[PDB]
C-alpha cells in the first residue's frame with residue numbers, strides 16, 4: 001500500500017538554510033550505484049549574505065583502482081520553488097574526483113539533532129526511484145538517542161528505504 005513515487009515524498013516544511021548551517025556528521029547512508037563516499041563523512045554547510053547555501057564534505061572514497069583517498073568535496077545549492085528541494089552542483093578539490101549535479105532534498109530535520117537527506121538520480125517510468133542515495137546526519141558525533149532513532153527509522157520507511165542503510169564510521173582516516 002506504500003506510495004514510493006518520488007513525487008509523493010514529503011520534505012521539510014519551511015526549511016531554514018541558516019538554522020541548518022554548521023557541521024553535520026553522517027551517521028548512516030543508503031548507497032546509490034557506482035562510486036561514492038564510503039565513510040568518515042563530515043559535511044559543513046554555510047549560507048552567504050545573499051542566502052546562497054554551499055557545503056564542503058570530506059570522506060574516504062575507494063577508487064576503481066582500489067586506491068583509498070580522502071576526498072575533499074564542494075557543493076553549491078540552487079533554490080527551487082520548494083524551500084527543502086535544491087539542485088546541487090558538486091566537484092572535488094582534486095581534479096580526478098567526480099563532478100556532478102544531483103537533486104538534494106531535505107526530507108526532515110529538527111536542525112538541532114538530526115537530518116534526513118535524499119536524492120533520486122534515476123527514476124523508473126512509474127515515478128519510483130531506480131537509483132537513489134540518502135544520508136542520515138547528526139549534530140553530535142556520538143549519534144542519537146533512541147527516541148530520535150525512532151523518528152529516523154520512520155523517515156527511512158517513508159522513502160521506501162527501510163533496512164537499506166548502513167552505519168558510517170569515523171576513525172580519523174581523513175584527519
Ligand SMILES: CC1=C(/C=C/C(C)=C/C=C/C(C)=C/CO)C(C)(C)CCC1
Nearest residue numbers: 035036043055057073074075090097098
Ligand atoms: C558535495 C556534498 C555532498 C555529496 C558528495 C558526493 C555525492 C560526492 C561523491 C564523491 C566521489 C564520488 C568521489 C569519487 O571520485 C553531500 C550530499 C554528502 C552533502 C554535502 C556536499
